[PDB]
Amino acid sequence: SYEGCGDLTIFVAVALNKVIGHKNQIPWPHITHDFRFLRNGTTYIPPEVLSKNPDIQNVVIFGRKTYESIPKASLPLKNRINVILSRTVKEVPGCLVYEDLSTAIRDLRANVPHNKIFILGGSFLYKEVLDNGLCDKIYLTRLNKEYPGDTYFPDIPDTFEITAISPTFSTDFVSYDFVIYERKDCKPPFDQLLMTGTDISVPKPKYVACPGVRIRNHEEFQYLDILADVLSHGVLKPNRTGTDAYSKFGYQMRFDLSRSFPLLTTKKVALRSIIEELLWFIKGSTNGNDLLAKNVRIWELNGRRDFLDKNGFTDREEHDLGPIYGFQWRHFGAEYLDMHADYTGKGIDQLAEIINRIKTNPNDRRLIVCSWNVSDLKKMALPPCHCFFQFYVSDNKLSCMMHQRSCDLGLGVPFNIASYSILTAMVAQVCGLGLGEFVHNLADAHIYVDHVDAVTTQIARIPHPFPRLRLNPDIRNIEDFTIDDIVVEDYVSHPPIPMAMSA
Amino acid sequence: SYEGCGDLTIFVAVALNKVIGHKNQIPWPHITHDFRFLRNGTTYIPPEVLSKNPDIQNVVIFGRKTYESIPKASLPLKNRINVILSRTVKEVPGCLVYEDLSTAIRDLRANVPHNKIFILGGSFLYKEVLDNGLCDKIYLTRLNKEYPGDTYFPDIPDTFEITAISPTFSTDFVSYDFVIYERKDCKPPFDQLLMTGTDISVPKPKYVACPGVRIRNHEEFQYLDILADVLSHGVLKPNRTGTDAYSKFGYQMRFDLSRSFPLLTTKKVALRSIIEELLWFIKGSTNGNDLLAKNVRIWELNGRRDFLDKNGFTDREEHDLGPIYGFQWRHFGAEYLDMHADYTGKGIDQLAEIINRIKTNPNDRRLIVCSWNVSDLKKMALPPCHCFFQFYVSDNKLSCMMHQRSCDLGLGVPFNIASYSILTAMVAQVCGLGLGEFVHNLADAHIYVDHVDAVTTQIARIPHPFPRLRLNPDIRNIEDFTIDDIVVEDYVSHPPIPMAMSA
Ligand SMILES: NC(=O)c1ccc[n+]([C@@H]2O[C@H](COP(=O)([O-])OP(=O)(O)OC[C@H]3O[C@@H](n4cnc5c(N)ncnc54)[C@H](OP(=O)(O)O)[C@@H]3O)[C@@H](O)[C@H]2O)c1
Ligand SMILES: NC(=O)c1ccc[n+]([C@@H]2O[C@H](COP(=O)([O-])OP(=O)(O)OC[C@H]3O[C@@H](n4cnc5c(N)ncnc54)[C@H](OP(=O)(O)O)[C@@H]3O)[C@@H](O)[C@H]2O)c1
Ligand SMILES: Nc1nc(=O)c2c(CCc3ccc(C(=O)N[C@@H](CCC(=O)O)C(=O)O)cc3)c[nH]c2[nH]1
Ligand SMILES: Nc1nc(=O)c2c(CCc3ccc(C(=O)N[C@@H](CCC(=O)O)C(=O)O)cc3)c[nH]c2[nH]1
Ligand SMILES: Nc1nc(=O)c2c(CCc3ccc(C(=O)N[C@@H](CCC(=O)O)C(=O)O)cc3)c[nH]c2[nH]1
Ligand SMILES: Nc1nc(=O)c2c(CCc3ccc(C(=O)N[C@@H](CCC(=O)O)C(=O)O)cc3)c[nH]c2[nH]1
Ligand SMILES: O=c1ccn([C@H]2C[C@H](O)[C@@H](COP(=O)(O)O)O2)c(=O)[nH]1
Ligand SMILES: O=c1ccn([C@H]2C[C@H](O)[C@@H](COP(=O)(O)O)O2)c(=O)[nH]1
């Protein structure tokens, strides 16, 4: 029945609730970037094929209803053979018309010189294509938001897997990315091996994040790869906590903050806790009760009585963490008494200083906030892990680099990535700047023994498109941001993964 | 004469003075790594070819004398067809013998089933092969030392170019790498382009280091690639000095210090100046005269009367640079008076504390020397560029990571790379540790406009194998190293490239 009708390639854009159409129209506001991706995907002809037949084109196939879903401004689709399937219309300007798919494909491959056939919907057509195994490859644009609709993309069969994932992009109404699914059952020159000067037979690593994904452009892969690399090649070392960890040294990640917000999607990350922690840093607090009071418990264990006493801090009030981040950001050099003291106008307000300098002298090469106050180290419950960051301006875009001396990959690193991304966005906004990159340096990167099963599970999870960040555009000063001013939209994630903190 | 005798592939190992042989023996102590490279290169059969004939072997061709040059025990060379050329010997146990090359190649390619033919010398044979254009590819082990000898490798014709370079390796007696030359005249799927989500036709970068080199495993490539990247994509910005610079933010380089010493070879680097400056940091000096007195002038322009005056240091004695590196390394938190004050027992001796912590608690995750003393910045003639570094120990190897806020890629970066490599080796030695990696994080990395021609010239230069470092093993304390205790052996470099410093 469908003899000769296979290897049909689908292009579709699909909302989170699988909706693809609403009142015969696209359900979301137009994403022209998606239109260009579709155009580029469906027009491509390999160089070899094109030099032999230079007039050769691909085919696009639609139901009639989808065909009207398109303007005249862009119709019939330029440089491709347009084909419409329909039992009620006989003729359409610019197109070939067939009564059914099996006739169409047969006629096409027998009688119409073309390169590749693409399937552009709608549901009727997609459903026929998938129920009958006629598709070997899907180009799918994933939108991280639900839209009202009445037309849906069918579930993709378990016979398919994701093999490519673009970077996450965003408009101001949705975050999205592009992926490729391929049917599983049809999905290294020697000099390269020799010229390493090392073993020509190098056994593949023990741990590989998402082995089936061959094009790995989602920024989350940086974090997943590092996890895989420390599990594969990390050395188990004792450490101060008394819970051992597999450790490796030296990594650099970067995130394009103009495109998306790098809140990990491979587990549900406690965003509320990250935001309260940052606002806590900004206002200069070193009182752990300020976080507890807001139902954030991430700093509880390093301020507990037994932890303080274990480390010689026998005169320290519980949850007085000492002159850590908040104190150094706002009062570097001031004498730390305790977490209740008035430090107003005492020490150096690095945070204020550097924001003002970004405004007045963007090309300054010393835009640094440093929490590694060597004189204060002995007073600290836990010396800063993210101990140093530096801003940078070019082309009216702010970037930030942070140095992290000690990186708990399971627990803290995901917090750190998201925290500095927000800080950069805040700083960019109060300075009237666009968004560049967050560059994250890992020095001692490790995975605690009791997180191994957690992270093994995690790195097998396919990333969702990252979410996007919106700050209240009215906030003019970094000290004014409240939690309601900091909104992460379109966060799609896998389930939370419990991991215990080693104090 | 030589019809059907082309595409013969050479393997040779060559001393810096082109010597390959001495008294019919190898002129250097044996490098078993080189033998292993040779054996792997000459025994490889492509998997496709091997399945069709699972007994197929390659050919190795020698002169009589070169055969006589290998132990009778290691011979005939295993898993290959051994061929000897000779006019004075007719039969050799388990080898083929020919009277001349042309006959040999013809007989072999017509009558002896085999995969690929290799040429293993000596000079008579290499010369005949090169003089007659019979070679399309050369596997060449470069040694950075001259050896006595009486047999030489001919000059390689300018019809060849280097297309592959291994990482630099070393024994205790020589620095070396592997390279491939290929004859010039005969030397990515669309999904990869589409799945970036950006412009599918990418204008190739304007600058590329060593475009001819396809396998780029020499660590110097990190530095050359970064030069090429900043030239290509960096933004022209003004800065403190009044000479503009192309600038790009965020890189990470690493150097395996157990293998070689990363003193750049694409220009002759002023190593003596690097050592004196480091010894100057170590002893804690902030007096620029201490450097001038050793005929090192790198800090002179930043301590000069006019520079001090124009930065408001009108009361500062000339070449009193203020509480910069030496002071922070040894006395962080002491009150800086001037460069003549006695600071003995004042402030925190970070350098001493970290070296002692490496000895007593190698798994500590706070092994940091921080020169970004925020309290002292306003006193400094030039706030530290390499402002923060951190050590790490695993598998009995010391690694180091440095954060450089501002990176004069033309002048200072080459100094910083070698400086921290020496410092790491020194610290490793006094703590009885082996050598791991130096990891170099660059924040604002830039190229001054007046260095563009210089660096454009530099990035087309093919790197030599890096040199190696030897410290005097008697030195037990970091303060005891003197210039004569720190020896760089086997430094081979292209000419110096003049570059002017912007103050
Ligand atoms: N977001 C996306 O990626 C995407 C992609 C495509 C479409 N859409 C949206 O989806 C909607 C259109 O889809 P839809 O499911 O409502 O309609 P559709 O599938 O485009 O068209 C339905 C009609 O096409 C004809 N047809 C389809 N398969 C046929 C076959 N095998 N043989 C004969 N005729 C066939 C029949 O028309 P007759 O009445 O002539 O028999 C059928 O009633 C629009 O809202 C559009 O914007 C979205
Ligand atoms: N480091 C390296 O990569 C390397 C590589 C190879 C060799 N080597 C060194 O080089 C030295 C040996 O080389 P070498 O140049 O002295 O000698 P060689 O070229 O190995 O052999 C000399 C003899 O080979 C014969 N021969 C070469 N080409 C011939 C041709 N076309 N037709 C007939 N006979 C031919 C002659 O034969 P008869 O005299 O027998 O008639 C000649 O006297 C040794 O010291 C060895 O260790 C070093
Ligand atoms: N990924 C994806 N997104 C979609 O919206 C979609 C559709 C919806 C129908 C549709 C088809 C073409 C264009 C259309 O206008 N196409 C123009 C693009 C305009 C341009 O960028 O120049 C074209 O030339 O293809 C607009 C809408 C089917 N398959 C799709 N797949
Ligand atoms: N060993 C160690 N690792 C660290 O990263 C760390 C920190 C960084 C802050 C931190 C601490 C705990 C959690 C954390 O527990 N997060 C959990 C729960 C989050 C929540 O429910 O709010 C998580 O699953 O992400 C997340 C972040 C302080 N002390 C630490 N000590
Ligand atoms: N790069 C290079 N280095 C050289 O020394 C060399 C030579 C010198 C002659 C020569 C040939 C083979 C071996 C020899 O013993 N080969 C053994 C090595 C055994 C092993 O290490 O396992 C082999 O099996 O090839 C040792 C010396 C020719 N071409 C060369 N090219
Ligand atoms: N703009 C700027 N860039 C810097 O890197 C820097 C420094 C770092 C130290 C430094 C200064 C000059 C040279 C240097 O001049 N090197 C020359 C000559 C070396 C010699 O012969 O001693 C070189 O060609 O490498 C190399 C290193 C202080 N102030 C600076 N200001
Ligand atoms: O913001 C933070 C703070 C701490 N840590 C981690 C690193 C270590 O796992 C632990 C601190 O222990 P030390 O490195 O100080 O020993 O907490 C983070 O990952 N991010
Ligand atoms: O060890 C050093 C010291 C300085 N610089 C460079 C960076 C800048 O080009 C210049 C210092 O100027 P500012 O970044 O402070 O403006 O010196 C280095 O590259 N390495």
Residue numbers in the entry:
A (entry chain B), B (entry chain A): 4 to 190, 196 to 511
Paper text:
The two complex structures of BbDHFR-TS have two ligands bound to each subunit of each protomer in the asymmetric unit. When both protomers from each BbDHFR-TS homodimer are compared, the complexed states reveal very similar modes of binding for both drugs to the TS subunit. The pteroyl-like groups of pemetrexed and raltitrexed are parallel to the uracil ring of dUMP when bound, mimicking the pteridine ring of the native cofactor mTHF. Although the ϕ angle of the C-terminal Ala511 in one protomer of the raltitrexed complex is rotated by approximately 30° relative to the other, this has no effect on the virtually identical binding modes of raltitrexed in both TS subunits in a single crystal structure. Both drug molecules are also observed in the DHFR subunit but appear to bind this substrate pocket with different geometries. However, the para-substitution pattern of benzamide in pemetrexed allows the formation of a salt bridge between the α-COOH of its glutamate tail and the Arg83 side chain. These interactions are not seen for pemetrexed, in which the glutamate group is in essentially the same conformation in both DHFR protomers, despite the differences in side-chain rotamers observed for the nearby Arg39 and Arg42. The antifolate drugs pemetrexed and raltitrexed are capable of binding to the DHFR and TS subunits of BbDHFR-TS, indicating a degree of affinity for both drugs to both folate-binding sites.
In this work, we describe the structural features of dihydrofolate reductase-thymidylate synthase from B. bovis (BbDHFR-TS), the causative agent of babesiosis in cattle. This 511-residue, 58.2 kDa bifunctional enzyme consists of a di­hydrofolate reductase (DHFR) subunit at the N-terminus and a thymidylate synthase (TS) subunit at the C-terminus connected by a linker. BbDHFR-TS is an obligate dimer, with two arginine side chains (Arg373′ and Arg374′) from a flexible loop in one protomer making contact with the terminal phosphate of the substrate dUMP in the opposite protomer.
